[PDB]
DNA sequence: GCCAGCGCTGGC
DNA sequence: GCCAGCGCTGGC
């Protein structure tokens, strides 16, 4: 695992990052939600959210937000 | 007044 | 029934 994970997310621009936080308790325990963090820190918890800052610097129609990587 | 952590729900 | 997407709020 119920660990905490943030890295580099290979699939974005430079400096993007990828985490994804197990939460702890209630009916959703278990459950990973999946953010990503711009190289200024800004957190973002949807494809639609990101697609309004990356959307024009790259194609997003591929991007699988829950897993982070291009489908292949 | 924010926001991490969770629940709700429309669309499938 | 599942889950993307996001509304809500307790604790700060």
Not at 25 to 32: D, E, K, N, V
Not at 54 to 72: A, W
Request: net charge positive; hydrophobic share 30%.
């Amino acid at each position: 695992s119920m660990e905490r994970k943030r890295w580099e997310c290979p699939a974005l621009p430079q400096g993007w990052e990828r985490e994804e936080v197990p939460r702890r308790s209630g009916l959703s325990a278990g459950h990973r939600d999946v953010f990503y963090y711009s190289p200024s820190g800004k957190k973002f918890r949807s494809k639609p959210q990101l697609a309004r800052y990356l959307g024009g610097s790259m194609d997003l129609s591929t991007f699988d937000f829950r897993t982070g990587k291009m489908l292949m």
